Amino acid sequence: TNYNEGTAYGNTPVILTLKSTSKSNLKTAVEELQKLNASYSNTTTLAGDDRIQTAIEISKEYYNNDGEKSDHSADVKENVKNVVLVGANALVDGLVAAPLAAEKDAPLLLTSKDKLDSSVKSEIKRVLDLKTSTEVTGKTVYIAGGVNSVSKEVVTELESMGLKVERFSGDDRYETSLKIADEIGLDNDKAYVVGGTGLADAMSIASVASTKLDGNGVVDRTNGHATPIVVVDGKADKISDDLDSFLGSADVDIIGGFASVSEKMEEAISDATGKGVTRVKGDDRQDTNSEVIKTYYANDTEIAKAAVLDKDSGASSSDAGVFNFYVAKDGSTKEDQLVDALAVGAVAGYKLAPVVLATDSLSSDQSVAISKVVGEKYSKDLTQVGQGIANSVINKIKDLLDM
Template identity: 35%
Template sequence: MKKELLLACGLFLALPVGQGFAEGKTALAEKWSVHQTHEMKLFGFNEDEGTYYEDEPNDTFAKATPVETGYFLSGSSHNQSVNNGKDIDLYKFTLKDEEDYSLVAYTQNQREQTLKIRVLSSDGEEVAKSTLFSEDGYDLQSIESVLTPGTYYLEVTNSYSTVLNENYAIFHDVYGYGQSFERLAGEDRYETSVKISQDGWLDGEAETAVLATGANFPDALSATPLAYRYGAPLLLTRQASLPAVVKNELVRLGVSKVFIVGGTSAVSADVENQVKNMGIKVTRLSGTDRYSTSVKIADEIGAGAVVVATGGNFADALSIAPIAAQLEMPILLSRKDSVPGAVSTFINNWDVERSYVIGGVNAISDAAAKKLPGVKRISGADRYATNSKIIDTFIEDIDTFFTYFATGTNYPDALAGSALAAQYSSPVILTNPAKANIATKTTVEKYMDQMYVYYILGGETALPQSAIDQLFAE
């Protein structure tokens, strides 16, 4: 997703307008980018885009464009002399039950102040009307209301000027107040990375993808901030050959550039050539070892602050990965007792003032940490407690509306999922697939009121439903 879209969604979600607004994030985050570039269609429903396009003329109840909740509505305020400078667009929808109803609307040229939306009953009475919220330069029209069963009409007008052609997009939906679960999983780790990509990126939406090995973790641990830097999914490949499902995903995404992280021992020259033969530009980021590879990736990102994690295990780096990405901090790998020279050189060259050391002294010793500028260590008794400490530390910087769960005993699913989580400013919670760690369970309980959609990364073998159920058991 586009960074500016997510920022706008983040501002929108922060407004004090009620729980229902927040739950519109799914469709907003996944579909709004369509309207940033889409040319208006004449009319009809586009299932791929999840959008109803107005069917003009729709200025009377009899001619109202029929729609359903849970989708975008796309239309144009077409004020001209023939309609006395006031185009009225009407959309018709029906509710079978009493529902908590939410609506948000934007215009193409930021004329939200003059956009007006009313919910009308079937007898023409006003039931609710939109109000304008503004924050940090972002405006939106929004409605939050409880609607009883019946047929309703959305009336859309824009009073900006007598002569006006202004495209607008509306998202409206009804919401319950419970959490929902969704599993993102394929037949293996490679297909799982594709399923994760498909959940976060529309067809043709990603110019860039990051490709990492699915066979071993060291070269891949620093890849998430790179993926976030380019709005890219993070896909996994076999060392010797590009899985067909991954190749097909590169085509679906419309990728024109791929970053391969790691040397040929991680991702072979044959894989690189397979990607190049697809007409895709390839840039390989690799060093002489895992530590210098992390620096090569960091050079592509830049730094004000950095994350330093052990290169000897995957859990600490993956726990911080989506948050480091969101805060544009590269992940540098270190030995336990000494900071590699390449890492120290990078820190000096970029005048880094803050270093977040992830994990305890068994991961990175105090002697090594003292060589870093502005050190703040984040650690717990084990990988799960460290993961919880990270979430607590950065809770003001993240949004737990979407929360991602991955096994803490292997890295592939959490790695691919961390790139998706970063796009939504979300955390990844590592959990024990056999028995829930008390720290993990405490974290879920602490932030449960802020969590609405839980994504389980990987299949039942990697992270069984029973492990998730333990986190929510009384």
């Protein structure tokens, strides 16, 4: 008759006694048990058999599922009225659509070129709460891309659902990005610039761009506004009149190295604006990714101050830190693998979370960057987006996150 040493739970199935000769072996067993026990509330994986399904999984997770909470710990939107749609094989068209999805309070979904997928058509019906009993009114689908990315047939089918459709597209990467940016607007007097080949650079900054700031730069996910991203040629000397008239006199941060955006283009934007342009650069995808994290998610930034207030409302500015994290592929082997980070961007803006780009390995800059921005007191969260990220990477990020 063992008189065990504590009060148990009404539904305790077993009274476990963990024993060992070595205090170390017992220490690690219970430590690993604590981590593996919390992994079910710490880690999430939003992935599917392909890009189209993965984006649906993100829409199912954060839009019209469980409702909105004041801690910003649940949904980005519960009463969804808009959807952003992108071509699954047209990443370059929808590259800067994440801040649009943010401003429109919309999930970002992916479709095939020629004909809308039944999977996606069902999702749109779900997230928008479309039923044959009520008139479909006030519901809009913004297509980011041209007719070669998302066909005309997709639109006519979307219209047979009673949905309003708005296309944003131009003759190339750069005109399309400008059309999307023009929808978002410069309510924060700022814009982020990336190069036509800096696909991994736009995916790193999407998080920051989709963060809704107020007039003083505080984080207001209720009455705030996101910041647009514009794509530029790079390796070029002038900006077009459209970009000039758009930018006006707004602050600009160029994300990426000089192979993505030349010094010539930097000075061109500087002259048209009449202001100094900031540059967050690196030598590779992961180096620019780390620099973005270190810069925009540092302790003294407003994102860090707001992110801790979501963990504990009575927390000081000295408690500032990053607590939610996303991880997706970097597209070194295949560049279209970046499309898994496009769908999450707006969500990372709401959740105040950076997106770490790594498939096979986590760089040393990324490791140091995460350790420098991660929070200290409260719990951490990591969501993996897509299939194919190495366990090396996940365990490394978990170690850095105290997980």
